[PDB]
Structure 1
Amino acid sequence: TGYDLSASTFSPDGRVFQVEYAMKAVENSSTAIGIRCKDGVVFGVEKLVLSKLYEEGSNKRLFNVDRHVGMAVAGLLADARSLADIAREEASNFRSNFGYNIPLKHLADRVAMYVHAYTLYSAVRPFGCSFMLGSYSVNDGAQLYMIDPSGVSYGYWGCAIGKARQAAKTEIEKLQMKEMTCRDIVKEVAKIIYIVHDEVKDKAFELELSWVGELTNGRHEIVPKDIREEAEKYAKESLK
């Protein structure tokens, strides 16, 4: 029966199957990881290269949503880009009305409400993307939130989204991340990314790293190239 064709229809057991199918869309994507320490947040993405004809920096999955806020996405990249624009507009409007930088919890709540508005009607389709928001400020500290296609936003210490999320979570639980520094976290992130990657099915990939903390003066940015290459060396050594 057609209980699964609209987002405005419940099934007899109380499920909206369209949102579940969007979640299935998220599970097919490559894995993104976020780890939070007392002084900052680090984001790592396994970016699959589908051809050698593509440049370095094509299909970025890490975005700057505000000068203090960064975003790591998985799923359908076009939906992720539209959501990134929504988040940017929310941050801009908050600064223009109230006069300071938006808190990360408020931004996550607003974006999650915008995402939830697409799970209610037959006229629109749910988003096929999941994402993590990360931020640092002196007042609020270091914050890492995750939002899924239904509109649930939760705060995390370590989060993984995509195809190898469970194995990545197992690896993240082995770290005492609260008493670690952002420099160590980058190497551990790279190591976990190299562990969860399946060379047989997925051919080749780039490592996309970014961070935000007191080390960066509360500005979200790409990890400098030397730190990235050192971390990649550590990760490739660990795999033997």
Structure 2
Amino acid sequence: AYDRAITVFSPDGRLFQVEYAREAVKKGSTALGMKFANGVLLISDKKVRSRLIEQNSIEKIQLIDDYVAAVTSGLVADARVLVDFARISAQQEKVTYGSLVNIENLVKRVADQMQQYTQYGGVRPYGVSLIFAGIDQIGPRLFDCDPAGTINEYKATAIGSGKDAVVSFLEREYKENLPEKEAVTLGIKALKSSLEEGEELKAPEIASITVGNKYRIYDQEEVKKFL
């Protein structure tokens, strides 16, 4: 039983309960982001699941502010709480300094919140991964962040069930500085490459931002033109 408590190391120096939290993330539907020419974008598959659901409501891409967005994968309620934290944390920085110079620090604060919940007994980790993408004073940024509080910056990445399919596809096909439309196409291709063949990709979410602008969310009909 090196397996049952967030505060117990295995004899090899592992924290299995953190690693299990990471398996929660795998049950989420795939999302991805990539940097392109003067910008960054996010695409999220949506496990669409009944015509009785309201579609234009509950959805995985969430604006953190006008210049920064996140997608999450894993336990939904955990994700919601972390997105709210991200939002409040963003505004605290804006009130203190007047702006958000480096998106990395927002992500670090979220990642620190997560790391705490891997070190003190009495809580479980968040079963969530996030991708954060936006423009800041360094440029267009793309980070992920996992249940352990681990951060990395990417040119392109994914989270969710289809992570590995989408990552190896991008490892093959990805190029820097694509125009936006080619970036989106590449993304849709990559996402498709992760589906069980004889399984059609329904309309995903797409959001993009380019230097000197605010985020825009593609509406369904703009997205279909890529399907």
**TM (normalized to structure 1)?**
0.88
Q: In structure 1, what is the Cα distance between the partners aligned to 2:19 and 2:104?
A: 25
- Is 1:209–2:209 an aligned residue pair? no
In the alignment, structure 2 segments of 5+ residues that lack a partner are none
Q: In structure 1, what is the Cα distance between the partners aligned to 2:133 and 2:213?
A: 11
- Please give the root-mean-square deviation of Cα atoms over the aligned residues, in Å: 1.8
Q: CA deviation at 1:225?
A: 4.2
- 1:223 partner letter: Y
Q: CA deviation at 1:105?
A: 0.8
**What does 1:1-240 align with in structure 2 at a 5 Å threshold?**
2-137=1-136, 139-198=137-196, 205-214=202-211, 217-232=212-227
Bigger Cα displacement from structure 2, 81-90 vs 33-42: 33-42
Q: In structure 2, what is the Cα distance between the partners aligned to 1:203 and 1:192?
A: 13
- 2:141 partner letter: Q
Q: In structure 2, what is the Cα distance between the partners aligned to 1:80 and 1:158?
A: 21
* Matched position secondary structure for 1:133: strand
Q: CA deviation at 1:226?
A: 4.2
- 1:87 partner letter: A
Counting aligned pairs with the same residue, the percent is: 31
- 1:44 partner letter: I
In the alignment, structure 1 segments of 5+ residues that lack a partner are 233-240
Bigger Cα displacement from structure 2, 189-198 vs 203-212: 203-212
* Matched position secondary structure for 2:5: coil
Q: Do the aligned residues in 1 keep the contact of 2:75 with 2:128 (CA within 8 Å)?
A: yes
Count of aligned pairs: 227
* Matched position secondary structure for 1:177: coil
**TM (normalized to structure 2)?**
0.93
- Pick closer, same or farther for the CA change 1:203–1:78 going to 2, 3 Å: farther
Q: CA deviation at 1:115?
A: 0.8
- 2:208 partner letter: W
